Amino acid sequence: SVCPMQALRNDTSIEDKLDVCVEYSLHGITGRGVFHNCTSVGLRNQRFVYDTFDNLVGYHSDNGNYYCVRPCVSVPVSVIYDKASNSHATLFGSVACSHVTTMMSPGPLQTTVGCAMGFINSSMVVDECQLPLGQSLCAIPPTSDVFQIATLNFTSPLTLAPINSTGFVVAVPTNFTFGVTQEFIETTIQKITVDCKQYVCNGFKKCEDLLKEY
Amino acid sequence: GFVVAVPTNFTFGVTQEFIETTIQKITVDCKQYVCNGFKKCEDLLKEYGQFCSKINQALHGANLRQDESIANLFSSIKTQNTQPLQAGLNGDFNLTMLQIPQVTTGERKYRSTIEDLLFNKVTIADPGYMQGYDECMQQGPQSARDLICAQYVAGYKVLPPLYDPYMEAAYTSSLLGSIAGASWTAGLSSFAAIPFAQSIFYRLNGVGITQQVLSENQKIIANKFNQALGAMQTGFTTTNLAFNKVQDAVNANAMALSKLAAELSNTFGAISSSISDILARLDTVEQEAQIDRLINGRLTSLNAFVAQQLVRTEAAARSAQLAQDKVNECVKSQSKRN
Amino acid sequence: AFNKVQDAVNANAMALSKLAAELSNTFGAISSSISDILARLDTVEQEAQIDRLINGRLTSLNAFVAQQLVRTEAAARSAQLAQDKVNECVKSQSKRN
Amino acid sequence: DLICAQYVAGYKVLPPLYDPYMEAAYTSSLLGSIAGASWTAGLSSFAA
Amino acid sequence: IDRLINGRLTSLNAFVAQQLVRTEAAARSAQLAQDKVNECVKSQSKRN
Amino acid sequence: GYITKAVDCGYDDLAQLQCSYESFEVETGVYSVSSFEASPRGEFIEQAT
Amino acid sequence: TWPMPIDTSKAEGVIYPNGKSYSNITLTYTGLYPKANDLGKQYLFSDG
Ligand SMILES: *[C@@H]1O[C@H](CO)[C@@H](O[C@@H]2O[C@H](CO)[C@@H](O)[C@H](O)[C@H]2NC(C)=O)[C@H](O)[C@H]1NC(C)=O
Ligand SMILES: *[C@@H]1O[C@H](CO)[C@@H](O[C@@H]2O[C@H](CO)[C@@H](O)[C@H](O)[C@H]2NC(C)=O)[C@H](O)[C@H]1NC(C)=O
Ligand SMILES: *[C@@H]1O[C@H](CO)[C@@H](O[C@@H]2O[C@H](CO)[C@@H](O)[C@H](O)[C@H]2NC(C)=O)[C@H](O)[C@H]1NC(C)=O
Ligand SMILES: *[C@@H]1O[C@H](CO)[C@@H](O)[C@H](O)[C@H]1NC(C)=O
Ligand SMILES: *[C@@H]1O[C@H](CO)[C@@H](O)[C@H](O)[C@H]1NC(C)=O
Ligand SMILES: *[C@@H]1O[C@H](CO)[C@@H](O)[C@H](O)[C@H]1NC(C)=O
Ligand SMILES: *[C@@H]1O[C@H](CO)[C@@H](O)[C@H](O)[C@H]1NC(C)=O
Ligand SMILES: *[C@@H]1O[C@H](CO)[C@@H](O)[C@H](O)[C@H]1NC(C)=O
């Protein structure tokens, strides 16, 4: 690079601050990202490695090591809210609970969809859910002190087995009720017309004279 | 009289069909998608926060409607009726391809053999629902396992499906066990437990084959059935329409995420698509007019993505209703529709 | 079925909400109000400021028209499904399980 | 009534997969499949 | 010139998005047309 | 015209959901909220002689 | 008088981009390059 002398800062190291978001100034190239020690790819005299979008993806360092470079990333967060109890809980999706404790600034519970906060392990089994978490997990609101994790699980009820004879077995009803299934079919939407000149210019003759072109 | 061409020899043939029931569920962190960190972009973006809210609310509503549709499809397990099938052959009909392999090892398999054959012919990127963030933090050669790490950089999230593989396996075992018997007669209220072979021979008797023909040709019919069932993996090629529809669905899911990630390299007429280079090369007055181009272009791109996902969700919910009709009229009964 | 009724009502109302909210989009100008632009700038800056609002609002009205077409064609398909249900479930006894 | 705007604007209308002879073959197959064609329970015989 | 470029590219994106929706709708009604051929032309339907 | 109640939007994740919906009352459900920000810490700098 | 045309399948006579490197990818690049299958001009030298 070519640099003015007033922009020269001294020097630092990366080996004590790996896998965090830092700022970098590497031989004139500046930016922001996450550095990870890696196995060497690309040509080491060109010193920088790019991708097809011309973003920096790797760096051959003066200390002899190659580093993979990523942009700065973020943990995804989900809030579980129940209006009747006015209660909430948290899920960090795709995060293992051993890493929530390090970047932290009932305990954290690992689930198949991530690390849950404010939940207790339970053995409850339901077949109907109003707060589904995915992968057959269901959140049960307090009425306890915290939300519970239960599983959606059900199977087919009665298994009549064939008899070893010359006839067969049939289950014939001896009592009944009438059930009602309800159903809704849409036939229509609401019909809208738009006044285009009123929507764009709102009165105002100077906008309308500019809008005559359109 | 008249002349009629009556069969003297036959085979069994298999038609294959694919029906889509679901798309991949996406949420977007709008502020991180538009401003990528960078407080000065966010200070400019505070004038547009009401438009960032509408995107999140529209996607929330679409994902909720898909969850309701899929729970209504799976509703029929809790009430059906079921007959237990033999492992291996049932009479002389061999059903091994459609059954889950009972293994003595330490793994609980949930797929049948023909399902494993179908799943080994499609390529799907693994979203990593449990610990995908920590596995994307230690990449190196990123294309070793097919992960979606663009989630955590660009600012979107793939949501897991409502049911786990155990429950889907339970649904298709319910469908398989509801085939023999299952309201033998007029109504739908009785459940007769007649075995599988007798059920097949009554279905053949009802289409024009008399009991003399069925008694004289028992092993021949069973051998032709086993021979047709043994050749179903031949249909898993790109000349077959159903296999092309399976691959078409996988590609539409991949195409939505590619088109999301690529719009972060549009300059929209700025000097760069990177916010850091704009902040390093211009002064404050020029910075503002350069960054608001990227803000307005990215917000318009998110609006187009939301409008695409709404129409895809509505299409998938109509075809889930069609799949329910197919299960009720072809798997669980004999249709009178030619 | 009740959730579907409420969904159709919310879809009609959300279309009108998204129509009205776009008139407060500045589209990168100093204001969403034309009155304020005409009060704070001279003619050469007024033209470049009003052209942003014009181009933004025309693009928004195009997106609205594209969404109404899709919704109208979907409603016309489900009216055909409704006629099938009236003919086969209410007016006779179907043989479709 | 030619679409000459194809060659100015930069788009191409593509031809359909079948020519009119094949479409006439389809609807003549349909007209000839009406009389008879398994007037009984199943679908596998053909009465003329 | 970059105003025209960004505008015309956004317009082409809208054209592509409308073409995908019309192609999917025509594919659904081709399946409906097949059902009408099979149940009304080639047979005698028992559906009121 | 008086202010009867407030919510600090940066206090926790439910406050941030209530601020994004612009409402003190929200429905039952599961919601994705805005992620945990990076805020970069250090500096790498390397250069030549 | 051996003809020696340019073979782009071996990337003959290609200038590498300056200041950077790529690894295990495929992209397009605008620059100054020789034509494919260009014979060029031959220069034959001899002792006196
Ligand atoms: C069918 O089920 C109904 C409902 O349980 C039975 O009606 C009950 O009859 C007993 C004795 O007659 C009464 O004590 C209950 O109060 C009735 N229940 C209700 C809800 O009214 C009926 O007896 C059953 N019939 C048969 C033949 O099983
Ligand atoms: C019906 O067709 C099958 C198939 O051609 C006939 O099976 C063949 O039988 C001959 C002699 O029995 C064998 O050599 C062939 O190998 C068989 N073919 C196959 C594919 O297995 C069968 O014989 C025919 N039935 C009648 C009554 O003619
Ligand atoms: C029922 O069908 C299965 C699958 O077609 C048969 O299993 C195959 O048997 C052959 C040789 O016996 C092996 O080469 C295959 O690897 C087997 N496949 C599987 C999935 O096990 C099975 O033998 C048939 N049953 C009977 C009784 O013949
Ligand atoms: C970084 O990686 C290189 C090669 O992969 C290795 O030699 C070096 O020891 C690593 N650094 C540390 C601190 O382990
Ligand atoms: C939750 O409970 C199950 C069984 O009840 C157990 O296998 C699992 O380890 C528990 N998990 C935690 C985090 O306590
Ligand atoms: C669901 O219940 C059945 C009952 O036996 C059990 O075997 C199965 O493991 C359960 N599945 C889950 C995911 O809890
Ligand atoms: C029928 O099966 C049972 C097994 O439960 C067996 O005890 C009985 O002997 C069988 N009947 C005949 C005729 O083999
Ligand atoms: C290079 O890319 C290809 C993709 O076609 C991949 O299969 C291969 O493993 C990559 N090589 C290395 C060393 O990562």
From Swiss-Prot, chain B:
Residues 112-133 are annotated as: Fusion peptide 1. Residues 218-268 are annotated as: Heptad repeat 1. The record marks R111, S112 as: Cleavage. Glycans are attached at N9, N94. Residues 131-153 are annotated as: Fusion peptide 2. Residues 247-291 form a coiled coil. Disulfide bonds join C136-C149. Mediates fusion of the virion and cellular membranes by acting as a class I viral fusion protein. Under the current model, the protein has at least three conformational states: pre-fusion native state, pre-hairpin intermediate state, and post-fusion hairpin state. During viral and target cell membrane fusion, the coiled coil regions (heptad repeats) assume a trimer-of-hairpins structure, positioning the fusion peptide in close proximity to the C-terminal region of the ectodomain. This is Spike protein S2. It comes from Bat coronavirus HKU5 (BtCoV). The lineage of its organism: Viruses, Riboviria, Orthornavirae, Pisuviricota, Pisoniviricetes. The gene is S. The chain holds residues 774 to 1111 of 1352 of the full protein.
From Swiss-Prot, chain E:
It comes from the Viruses. Acts as a viral fusion peptide which is unmasked following S2 cleavage occurring upon virus endocytosis. This is Spike protein S2'. It comes from Bat coronavirus HKU5 (BtCoV). The gene is S.
